[PDB]
Amino acid sequence: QPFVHSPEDRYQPFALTDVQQAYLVGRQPGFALGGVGSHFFVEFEIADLDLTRLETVWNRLIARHDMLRAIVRDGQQQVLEQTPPWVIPAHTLHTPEEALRVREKLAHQVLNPEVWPVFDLQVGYVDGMPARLWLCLDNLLLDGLSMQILLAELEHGYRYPQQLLPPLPVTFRDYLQQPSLQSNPDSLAWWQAQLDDIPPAPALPLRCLPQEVETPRFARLNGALDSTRWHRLKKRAADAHLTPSAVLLSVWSTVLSAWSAQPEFTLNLTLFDRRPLHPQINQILGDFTSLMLLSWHPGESWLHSAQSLQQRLSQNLNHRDVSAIRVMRQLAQRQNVPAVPMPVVFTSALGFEQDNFLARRNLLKPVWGISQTPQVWLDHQIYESEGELRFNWDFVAALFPAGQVERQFEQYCALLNRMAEDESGW
Numbered sequence: 001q002p003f004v005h006s007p008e009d010r011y012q013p014f015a016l017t018d019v020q021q022a023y024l025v026g027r028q029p030g031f032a033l034g035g036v037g038s039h040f041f042v043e044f045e046i047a048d049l050d051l052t053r054l055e056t057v058w059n060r061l062i063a064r065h066d067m068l069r070a071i072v073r074d075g076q077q078q079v080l081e082q083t084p085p086w087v088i089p090a091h092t093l094h095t096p097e098e099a100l101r102v103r104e105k106l107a108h109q110v111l112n113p114e115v116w117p118v119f120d121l122q123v124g125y126v127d128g129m130p131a132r133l134w135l136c137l138d139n140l141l142l143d144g145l146s147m148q149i150l151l152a153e154l155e156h157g158y159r160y161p162q163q164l165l166p167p168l169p170v171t172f173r174d175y176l177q178q179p180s181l182q183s184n185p186d187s188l189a190w191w192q193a194q195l196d197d198i199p200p201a202p203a204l205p206l207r208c209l210p211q212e213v214e215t216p217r218f219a220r221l222n223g224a225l226d227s228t229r230w231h232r233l234k235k236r237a238a239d240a241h242l243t244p245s246a247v248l249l250s251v252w253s254t255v256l257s258a259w260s261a262q263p264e265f266t267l268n269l270t271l272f273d274r275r276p277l278h279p280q281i282n283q284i285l286g287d288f289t290s291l292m293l294l295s296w297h298p299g300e301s302w303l304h305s306a307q308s309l310q311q312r313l314s315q316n317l318n319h320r321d322v323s324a325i326r327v328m329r330q331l332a333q334r335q336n337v338p339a340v341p342m343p344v345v346f347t348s349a350l351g352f353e354q355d356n357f358l359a360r361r362n363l364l365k366p367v368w369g370i371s372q373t374p375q376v377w378l379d380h381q382i383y384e385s386e387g388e389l390r391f392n393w394d395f396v397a398a399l400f401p402a403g404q405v406e407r408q409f410e411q412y413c414a415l416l417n418r419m420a421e422d423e424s425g426w
């Protein structure tokens with residue numbers, strides 16, 4: 001199948017993906033949460049910031065990546081051909097407390113997707129301290145993998161500002177227009193065949209009704225598993241006939257089981273892999289997200305339920321052309337309820353060749369970040385960098401009893417490290 005380019009329609013409107021549609025309606029009150037945006041915010045520290053150089057690098061990226069010039073207009077998405085160069089706002093701050101107040105303001109801003117730009121990038125100079133770079137990107141337009149690609153290019157361009165990259169020979173707009181993305185065969189039937197075996201989302205203790213949260217604010221807990229333990233864990237996984245993702249999903253689900261009203265539950269898995277329709281498809285920015293339900297059914301031993309989860313994961317992956325968005329509608333109809341939410345999410349950026357993403361010695365040193373997703377209470381995100389497994393839980397703090405998420409994270413980290421070191425649980 002040869003890829004079909006349409007350069008004459010590069011700036012014409014094109015349809016939103018299912019995920020993008022869900023994000024847009026997620027700005028309003030929903031069945032599982034109040035309205036909230038969908039952006040991704042990171043604060044960097046830069047010693048000896050050269051603003052002119054950073055501005056050059058960032059504007060080159062805007063010109064290079066069509067979806068940085070994209071907007072949502074009249075219920076569709078559209079790439080703007082020419083946008084005014086981004087002149088980086090710079091704040092002059094005297095104390096880190098002043099910088100914190102700016103961080104808090106920018107980290108919870110509302111990106112209006114109808115007016116370019118659907119991003120924000122500002123800098124803050126702190127007297128006698130490294131300068132701050134506050135970057136806000138929207139998952140409505142750039143998925144998790146895309147933001148790793150963009151952040152690595154930003155870091156690379158700032159370190160080596162003399163290098164010029166050749167233009168990209170393929171666009172996200174054309175990718176969505178390809179025939180493969182318009183072909184559901186037995187996948188819809190296969191999912192419908194097991195609606196009666198998909199339990200609800202984790203029944204975690206709440207401190208209030210999630211709909212009674214008018215302005216959801218996300219918080220982050222982050223951790224890492226050292227490279228020696230991550231290597232050993234992946235080896236134990238292989239010996240146990242499990243993928244690394246299945247092990248992490250199984251360790252996480254064990255903690256979630258201990259807290260939930262029912263031990264069995266269903267998670268929503270966020271994946272980023274792309275159909276290989278063009279040899280450079282993995283270099284571009286866009287929304288390639290696929291959503292897939294995965295159910296945890298505990299057994300006698302952790303290993304049994306992990307192996308059972310792996311098998312289910314392998315089968316489910318063979319039917320991702322039917323997204324979890326549709327399966328949740330099918331579940332709601334079979335159960336005669338208005339909606340079946342899945343607000344507990346696992347997001348994996350493993351296996352995408354982004355080695356040394358946010359590497360230790362980066363000039364743009366990440367120090368603080370947060371991400372928001374509508375209709376999601378708890379989002380466990382993972383990626384690998386420098387041989388190390390890095391993870392973070394993004395969650396609506398106000399939803400849960402004080403100390404609860406912090407305690408689950410503590411238990412999860414402890415269980416993760418012990419199973420990497422101790423052969424007992426296997």
Ligand code: NA
Pocket residue numbers: 038039040139371372373
């Ligand atoms: Na987000």
